[PDB]
Design a protein around this ligand. Sequence first.
Ligand SMILES: *[C@@H]1O[C@H](CO)[C@@H](O[C@@H]2O[C@H](CO)[C@@H](O[C@@H]3O[C@H](CO)[C@@H](O)[C@H](O)[C@@H]3O)[C@H](O)[C@H]2NC(C)=O)[C@H](O)[C@H]1NC(C)=O
Ligand SMILES: *[C@@H]1O[C@H](CO)[C@@H](O[C@@H]2O[C@H](CO)[C@@H](O[C@@H]3O[C@H](CO)[C@@H](O)[C@H](O)[C@@H]3O)[C@H](O)[C@H]2NC(C)=O)[C@H](O)[C@H]1NC(C)=O
Ligand SMILES: *[C@@H]1O[C@H](CO[C@@H]2O[C@@H](C)[C@@H](O)[C@@H](O)[C@@H]2O)[C@@H](O)[C@H](O)[C@H]1NC(C)=O
Ligand SMILES: *[C@@H]1O[C@H](CO)[C@@H](O)[C@H](O)[C@H]1NC(C)=O
Ligand SMILES: *[C@@H]1O[C@H](CO)[C@@H](O)[C@H](O)[C@H]1NC(C)=O
Ligand SMILES: *[C@@H]1O[C@H](CO)[C@@H](O)[C@H](O)[C@H]1NC(C)=O
Ligand SMILES: OC[C@H]1O[C@@H](O)[C@H](O)[C@@H](O)[C@H]1O
Lengths: 391, 390
Amino acid sequence: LDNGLARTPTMGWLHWERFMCNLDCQEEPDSCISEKLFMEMAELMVSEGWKDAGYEYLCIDDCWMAPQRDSEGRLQADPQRFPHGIRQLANYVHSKGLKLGIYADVGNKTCAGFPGSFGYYDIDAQTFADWGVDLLKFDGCYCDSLENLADGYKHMSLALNRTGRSIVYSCEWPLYMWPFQKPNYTEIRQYCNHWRNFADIDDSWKSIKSILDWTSFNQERIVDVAGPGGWNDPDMLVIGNFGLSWNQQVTQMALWAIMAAPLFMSNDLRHISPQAKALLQDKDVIAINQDPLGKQGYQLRQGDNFEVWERPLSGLAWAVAMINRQEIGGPRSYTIAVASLGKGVACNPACFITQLLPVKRKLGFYEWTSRLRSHINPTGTVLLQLENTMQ
Amino acid sequence: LDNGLARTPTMGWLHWERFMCNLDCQEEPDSCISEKLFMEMAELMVSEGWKDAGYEYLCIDDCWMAPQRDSEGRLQADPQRFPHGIRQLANYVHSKGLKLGIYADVGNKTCAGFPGSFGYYDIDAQTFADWGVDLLKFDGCYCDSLENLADGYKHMSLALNRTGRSIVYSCEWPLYMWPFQKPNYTEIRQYCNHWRNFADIDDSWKSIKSILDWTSFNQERIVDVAGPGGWNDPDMLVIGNFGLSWNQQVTQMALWAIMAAPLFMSNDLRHISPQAKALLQDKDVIAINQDPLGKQGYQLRQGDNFEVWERPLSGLAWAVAMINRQEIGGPRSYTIAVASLGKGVACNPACFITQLLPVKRKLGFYEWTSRLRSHINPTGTVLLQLENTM
Ligand SMILES: *[C@@H]1O[C@H](CO)[C@@H](O[C@@H]2O[C@H](CO)[C@@H](O[C@@H]3O[C@H](CO)[C@@H](O)[C@H](O)[C@@H]3O)[C@H](O)[C@H]2NC(C)=O)[C@H](O)[C@H]1NC(C)=O
Ligand SMILES: *[C@@H]1O[C@H](CO)[C@@H](O[C@@H]2O[C@H](CO)[C@@H](O[C@@H]3O[C@H](CO)[C@@H](O)[C@H](O)[C@@H]3O)[C@H](O)[C@H]2NC(C)=O)[C@H](O)[C@H]1NC(C)=O
Ligand SMILES: *[C@@H]1O[C@H](CO[C@@H]2O[C@@H](C)[C@@H](O)[C@@H](O)[C@@H]2O)[C@@H](O)[C@H](O)[C@H]1NC(C)=O
Ligand SMILES: *[C@@H]1O[C@H](CO)[C@@H](O)[C@H](O)[C@H]1NC(C)=O
Ligand SMILES: *[C@@H]1O[C@H](CO)[C@@H](O)[C@H](O)[C@H]1NC(C)=O
Ligand SMILES: *[C@@H]1O[C@H](CO)[C@@H](O)[C@H](O)[C@H]1NC(C)=O
Ligand SMILES: OC[C@H]1O[C@@H](O)[C@H](O)[C@@H](O)[C@H]1O
């Protein structure tokens, strides 16, 4: 989308994976979708270094709405759970130097069953702008017509544009197309800042794997369309929760960097380990994800339960990720000629290699003819940065 | 098996899951299957408090053997990887106050392709005893008939008894017949100290779930047969490795205690996190696993992606495990009437409840009228001990 936004992949926090549609503020007050949760999350984003690391957007997902629209046909926040409204929540979020994301649906209802935007695209977009919304995640439930789907996503794109407000437009367009036909990604890019391609992530290694496998299987269709202002969205970072081992967390962080993915954490910032925090706030890994060239990476190689991915970076630098997909035994050695990396450019005539994950370690100078030898933990990833050099 | 052994589930370390069949001592001398590897583990079992916690059996799995039997028709350890021989390794292990387990196969070859014991059961049994072996894991590969399988397991059982040496007998009997026939567990128990029921574990949460799910589905057939001298074997503890989250590791530790399972760690004792070590060495949790009553727990309830398992203990105590099987969202509230726990006797008229996992915390007195309220992490388990108040 040519709106001047998402020139690098968007970074922030989104409630969905970790908090979902918890409406029970009486028996689950700490977990329910309330203005208090978003306020408290905003406070920790500032005080715990998240904003400094680049996580700017505090995002509300589904289940913020009142059951019905008001007497004007405008959306309302739930009166019991958001008694002060979205306007004052946005004011609060902006005073902390952060931005506010919200959620709506192209069909007649949201996925959770709250008012949908069909028939209200212009009204809904304007009320978001009036409230001071900075990002919109637009879902695709309760829309069984292919025509309506495309018309809605296109309509809402222009509807937001006409407000004069700078709002990041996050679409689920391609994901809801697959049941009907293969998406036109050139068209989606024209209208969206980023787009969900695949099924919702959950708190599991199974889910990370299925997202990676879908991406690599479909990469010839999606890689080259990504770039400044328009990114593929493989869904939320789920590091800091419950279902991933340390190595599986490393794999997600490393690969979301390779993929030029928007980085939306879905976790609890009030209850997060020092280890998960350090990984999510890793300067060098975030710098890869945020590289100004904006070229999405890809799977270079697969075989023998190993995967090699690489991403071209600015200044003839490259990020290389090696995944060990064997889920038995111990660390396995993998060797590769550096000439095979970065299309033969990264290390011609030499490169300086620095391991970034699982730990940061300078590996030294590698001649074009030389071999890189490494060891990779089961379900883990080794992430390397290659710096082209004459030295 | 009435040999006076495995009166509580066997505890130790077994190389298989973590170290596999690595024969590359040239490129990987620190992780290949060798005498050195077992010496290093033996030292750490003593020095790092594993033996103190109850882990007594240091066990060799497959890939210790030379390609062929010696000139006398006996099994021999690989001459390069085990240069001093097994008898010498057992001498060393014993001097450390530990016990040595080894591995053989009922068929014509082991699963990795080394000499099988079919036709050599009496020689092999006597060889093991002579070496000072304290445990045998007896695999089921390359056995062409169910009759040969049953006969071999019975034969080796009797052959070990005739040596006069106390040797724990670990069988894979039921696992290898399950595809073809329902096992007779009364019969297996008569011959074995513990028995593998289900597919090999690996370093994954998928695997833990499969094992748990198989066990709860088959519990009517397997729970009551277990007891002192004969245990169901759901396979190795894989805590301390790479594929399990903290909460998934807690689930394995807690449920292996509920199941009265043998506790064979398969990990790298040289490279293990303090968190993993503390869990594996948890006194209170080990004590449940090791309860002298030896009554295997069972799944009590299943619904809304929650499972409740319980185990009767000595002196009118019970262990209760609550698993959260939903793999999305956050810590999830579960409640149950305490009157539904422990067959309605655990908390009549009252019980004191202590949470053991994920952390140790006294919950207090619960009347027979009470409800137990808990928040359980996705893929995690809450493990409790109930003491009847009298
Ligand atoms: C509503 O839609 C229009 C049309 O796409 C948007 O205007 C476009 O804005 C972008 C960026 O603001 C302009 O692209 C270029 O910006 C770079 C900045 O580095 C500059 O070097 C180039 O000279 C160029 O201006 C683009 O020209 C412009 N498109 C048109 C046809 O005017 C607009 O931003 C949308 N939303 C809003 C906030 O109104
Ligand atoms: C070979 O097999 C025989 C027979 O199955 C085993 O003998 C059994 O040994 C156990 C434990 O040593 C005996 O149980 C014990 O009985 C005494 C009663 O005097 C009691 O004080 C102990 O608490 C315990 O219950 C069991 O009775 C005995 N069975 C028979 C029928 O004699 C023998 O141990 C096996 N030998 C080896 C080396 O495995
Ligand atoms: C062990 O093997 C015996 C002989 O096996 C025969 O020769 C080998 C090379 C194969 O080709 C096989 O098909 C032949 O039967 C068997 O008599 C015996 O049953 C085997 N024992 C077990 C338990 O598998
Ligand atoms: C929403 O409902 C209207 C009227 O009931 C219907 O005509 C339309 O098909 C629905 N909209 C979408 C986009 O599914
Ligand atoms: C995809 O959509 C774009 C923009 O609407 C258009 O230029 C192109 O023809 C479409 N591609 C195909 C093959 O339909
Ligand atoms: C099971 O095995 C035991 C011991 O061999 C025997 O007493 C019993 O008859 C067997 N039962 C069945 C169902 O075959
Ligand atoms: O999307 C581009 C990529 O396409 C892959 O199929 C190919 O193996 C890579 O070399 C890379 O060029």
